[PDB]
């Protein structure tokens, strides 16, 4: 109940190290807060008698200091090591900088040390005596040089070690094998190089191992089969090489394996094709070759399978619909030059499929097959079927489809009616095709659609009024997408809401009612026949980041009300019939002179004086 005096003096030292005051602590001494550190917020006391301290005084001792997310700036004072009964030290997600005193790695009672997400830098202390420590987390700091070679010599009770997101360098220390009790080891996002020391495979309680994003090299030795309790392994973004060892019968708990973006080659080992455990499998962006083979009788846990961007040859495996839990497939950038097997009509587990840039052919049968997969949510056909004809058959139905992208195929035909059988469409990309006709007004009735890309086609006619009324533009496991370097979008909600009709033949004017779409981030009308006045009411699109009207026939004035778009970063009226003063609002003054070019009668700032 009553703060120990030495503990209080240690906490007072910690306090000066900081550049700002912690609320819930009596700080300045003009503070009206309690002088008893035990009622300070983030501090937990235990009786001296419960800690087995039999001495003359009965006082509260500080066993937990938990300051996570308190917005702390300063150093970490050495005097924190004066608190000898400390069990938990949690400083996570703060601004603290400086080095870590060796003193603090000497505390005998310490159980959790969590320093993560700070500015700590310099070398990590080489002397670790922390015989009570379950958890050591330095994730996300500025530490550099070697991981301590002696790291585990004094950590007999250790459970989680996380060094990830630092500058640590060198080979993983041969002493990493003395970590015997460890379950979690994060090394990812560092400078580590050389081979994996054979001694890593002696850690028999190892459960999760994160090695991704380093320079690790050499083969991946068969000794991996020694870690039989391993459930999750990320080897991604290193440079390893050679065949993948055929150990997967030995790792019977392994549910997660990610080797992507390495130099691996040869065929996938037989045992991996047989794993009864693996759930997520990502091999993408390696040199793997041969005919893809999975025993879907053996593979009863498979859910995410990602082979994209590999050297595979032969046929699309026709037995994959026999993997009963399999949900997502990224087959992108494997060049099959075949069509989709008839048997995919039975894939009822599949929610997401990408054949992007896989040289698939006969789109007519592709859609006829794929409509029978009831659970299809995401379908990416980009860069296939080149020059074929986008089926106009009314019969096709994808009921559950959220995302449809068939882009850059040079497809011919019109926007087909069958697409209306997907009332839940959020995202539609038909861009970069030979598609013709008029954009059908029924698109307006899609109540979930927030992203529409019709760009770089032959469409003609007017923009339909109904787009003005799209419900989701009026008001408000993993399958990465990349947008043409390409930026990565993790799910559909990551794309700014968009209407991109750019690069077509559309005639007509721009409807005033666009001002009703308050959730629209991007409007791209560039490169069309659009004529008439830019409506003042565009001012009402409050969320609009990008407004591109360039290369059209538009006449009249840029409406001064466009100053009310405060989020508008990027804008072009270039090459139109436009005339009059350019709006002087703040966003406009930051637009480049090229945004207004090719309009003779435009004047004011950005042009010749009116």
């Amino acid at each position: 109940l009553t703060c120990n005096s030495n503990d209080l003096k240690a906490l007072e030292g910690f306090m000066r190290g900081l550049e700002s005051s912690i609320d819930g602590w009596k700080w300045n001494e003009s503070s009206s807060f309690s002088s008893n550190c035990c009622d300070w917020v983030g501090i937990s006391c235990k009786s001296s008698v419960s800690l087995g301290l039999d001495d003359v005084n009965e006082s509260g001792r500080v066993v937990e200091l938990e300051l996570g997310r308190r917005k702390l700036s300063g150093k970490l004072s050495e005097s924190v090591a004066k608190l000898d009964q400390l069990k938990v030290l949690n400083l996570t997600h703060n601004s603290l900088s400086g080095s870590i005193a060796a003193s603090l790695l000497n505390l005998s009672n310490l159980e959790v040390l969590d320093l993560s997400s700070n500015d700590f830098s310099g070398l990590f202390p080489s002397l670790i005596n922390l015989p009570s420590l379950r958890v050591l987390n330095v994730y996300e700091n500025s530490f550099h040089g070697l991981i301590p070679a002696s790291l585990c010599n004094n950590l007999p009770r250790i459970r989680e070690i996380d060094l990830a997101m630092n500058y640590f360098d060198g080979s993983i220390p041969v002493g990493i094998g003395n970590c015997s009790s460890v379950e979690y080891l994060g090394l990812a996002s560092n400078n580590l190089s050389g081979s994996i020391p054979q001694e890593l495979f002696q850690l028999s309680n190892l459960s999760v191992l994160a090695l991704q994003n380093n320079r690790l090299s050499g083969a991946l030795s068969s000794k991996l089969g020694k870690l039989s309790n391993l459930g999750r392994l990320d080897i991604s973004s290193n440079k390893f090489s050679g065949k993948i060892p055929d150990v997967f019968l030995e790792l019977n708990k392994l549910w997660y394996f990610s080797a992507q973006s390495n130099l691996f080659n040869g065929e996938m080992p037989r045992s991996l094709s047989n794993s009864r455990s693996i759930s997520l499998l990502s091999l993408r962006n390696n040199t793997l070759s041969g005919q893809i083979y999975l025993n879907c009788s053996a593979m009863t846990n498979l859910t995410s399978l990602d082979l994209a961007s590999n050297s595979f040859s032969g046929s699309i495996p026709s037995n994959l619909p026999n993997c009963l839990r399999l949900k997502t497939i990224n087959f992108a950038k494997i060049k099959f030059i075949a069509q989709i097997p008839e048997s995919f009509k039975n894939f009822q587990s599949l929610t997401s499929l990408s054949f992007s840039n896989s040289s698939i052919q006969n789109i007519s049968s592709a859609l006829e097959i794929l409509q029978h997969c009831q659970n299809l949510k995401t379908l990416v056909l980009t860069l296939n079927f080149q020059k074929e004809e986008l089926p106009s058959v009314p019969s096709l139905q994808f009921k559950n489809l959220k995302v449809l992208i068939i882009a850059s195929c040079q497809l011919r035909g019109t926007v087909p009616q069958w697409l209306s059988n997907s009332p839940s469409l959020q995202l539609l990309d038909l861009s970069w095709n030979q598609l013709s006709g008029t954009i059908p007004p029924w698109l307006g009735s899609l109540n979930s659609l927030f992203y529409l890309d019709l760009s770089n086609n032959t469409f003609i006619g007017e923009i339909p009024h109904s787009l003005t009324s799209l419900q989701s533009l009026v008001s408000k496991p993993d399958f990465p997408f990349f947008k043409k370097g390409g930026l990565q979008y993790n799910q559909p909600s990551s794309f700014p809401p968009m209407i991109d009709l750019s690069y077509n033949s559309l005639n007509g004017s721009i409807w005033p009612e666009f001002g009703d779409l308050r959730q629209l981030h991007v409007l791209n009308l560039k490169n069309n026949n659009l004529s008439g006045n830019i409506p003042a009411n565009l001012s009402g699109m409050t969320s609009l980041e990008v407004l591109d009207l360039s290369h059209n026939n538009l006449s009249g004035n840029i409406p001064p009300s466009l100053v009310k778009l405060s989020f508008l970063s990027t804008f072009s009226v270039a090459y139109n019939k436009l005339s009059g003063p350019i709006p002087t609002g703040v966003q406009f003054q930051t637009f480049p002179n090229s945004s207004f070019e090719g309009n003779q009668g435009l004047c004011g700032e950005h042009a010749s004086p009116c």
């Binding site: 993408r284 962006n285 994209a308 961007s309 990224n330 992108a332 950038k333 990408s354 992007s356 840039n357 990416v380 980009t382 860069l383 992208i405 882009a407 850059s408 990309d429 861009s431 970069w432 890309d453 399958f479 990465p480 997408f481 990349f482 947008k483 043409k484 390409g486 979008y489």
Partner: peptide
């Protein structure tokens, strides 16, 4: 256009 890889 959107693609995956």
């Amino acid at each position: 256009y959107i693609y995956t890889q």
